[PDB]
Amino acid sequence: IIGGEFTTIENQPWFAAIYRRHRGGSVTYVCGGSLISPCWVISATHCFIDYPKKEDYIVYLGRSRLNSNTQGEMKFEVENLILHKDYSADTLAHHNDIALLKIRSKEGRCAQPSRTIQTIALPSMYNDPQFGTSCEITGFGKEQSTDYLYPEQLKMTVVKLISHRECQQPHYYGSEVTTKMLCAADPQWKTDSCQGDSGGPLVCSLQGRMTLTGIVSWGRGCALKDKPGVYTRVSHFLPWIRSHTKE
Ligand SMILES: Nc1nc2ccc(C(=O)NCC(=O)O)cc2s1
């Protein structure tokens, strides 16, 4: 998250922090995600495609910090890593960049809600705010593009929804951007998602409810003029999500 501000998990209690175990046993951060129900975290497929095996992943809920534990956090394994069959990666653009992780504890349970761990509503089908709407994005991604380190403290910022039509332009993304994607950006290109924020939430207030409108997916650089952040448009994948979150 370029710009924006520091936050804690109370202000985004559905945010999930996804890590992977390396052979040799170091644990490194992967991406964010969003808890949509007690046993289901939603994220991007690109976070996972190179290491598609569900036993290497660890998911924390209720965690505000990168490399230190937060009081009341819950730690999970991935009983289940579900990647979108139609995924596709071009140079930048990732298509169908959506993934479901079914979480379970060593004790075999899902999330128990708390002050620091709640779920986020999906939008209803093909229902998104109008362009120019202000939404929030959350993550542990880089604070500046040149950084080597990721912030130890969770961050969020505000970006505004850009029309399919604006984002369509040459000087923007041309045809890299589909109607299954959403663009969002700051009017001064001042603040943005960046490397490491992938998989986490773009949350818009939609009919006065906090709604998971987008999932951080890609962009050319960060906080670059004419180069918005690109988000998977959740309201075009509800059947995929509905089918894949069952028995
Ligand atoms: N809005 C975004 N800008 C960028 C720039 C770079 C990257 C990127 O390379 N990320 C690696 C990663 O996914 O963490 C992701 C984004 S998402």
Q: Where are the domains of the chain?
A: 1-12+120-235, 13-119+236-247
Residue pair 134/197 in contact by the 8 Å Cβ criterion: no
Residue pair 232/181 in contact by the 8 Å Cβ criterion: yes
Residue type at position 22: H
Tokens of 206: 């939609």
Residue type at position 91: T
Residue pair 64/7 in contact by the 8 Å Cβ criterion: yes
Q: How many CB atoms lie within 10 A of CB 135?
A: 24
Residue type at position 200: G
Nearest residue (CA) to ligand 1, atom 14:
196
8-state DSSP, 19? E
Best residue among 218, 220, 226, 230 to mutate for probing ligand 1's pocket (most ligand atoms within 8 Å of CB) is 218
Residue pair 154/134 in contact by the 8 Å Cβ criterion: no
Instruction: State the CATH class of domain 1-12+120-235.
Output: mainly beta
Task: Tokens 């509800």: give the residue.
Answer: 238
* Ligand 1 centroid – CA 142 distance (Å): 9
8-state DSSP, 240? H
Residue pair 217/139 in contact by the 8 Å Cβ criterion: no
3 state DSSP class of 80: strand
Q: How many CB atoms lie within 10 A of CB 118?
A: 17
Long-range contacts of 205-208 (CB under 8 A, 24+ apart): 205/129, 205/135, 206/123, 206/127, 206/128, 206/129
Q: How far apart are CA 66 and CA 145, in angstroms?
A: 18
- Estimate to the nearest angstrom the gap between the alpha carbon of 154 and the chain centroid: 13
Nearest residue (CA) to ligand 1, atom 6:
195
CATH fold, domain 13-119+236-247, is Thrombin, subunit H (2.40.10)
Enumerate the active-site residues: 46, 97, 198
In this chain, the answer to whether the domains covering 1-12+120-235 and 13-119+236-247 adopt an identical fold is yes
The contacts of residue 60 (CB under 8 Å, 6+ apart) are: 16, 17, 19, 73, 74, 75, 76
Does 211 sit in the ligand 1 pocket, CB within 6 Å? Answer: no
Residue pair 95/119 in contact by the 8 Å Cβ criterion: no
| C-alpha separations of 129 from 42, 134, 160, 218, 238 in Å | 20, 9, 10, 20, 17
Residue pair 76/104 in contact by the 8 Å Cβ criterion: yes
Q: How far apart are CA 94 and CA 44, in angstroms?
A: 10
Q: How many CB atoms lie within 10 A of CB 80?
A: 15
Q: Residue 59: which H helix or E strand, with range?
A: strand 57-61
3 state DSSP class of 45: helix
Does 123 sit in the ligand 1 pocket, CB within 6 Å? Answer: no
Does 198 sit in the ligand 1 pocket, CB within 6 Å? Answer: yes
Does 18 sit in the ligand 1 pocket, CB within 6 Å? Answer: no
3 state DSSP class of 146: coil
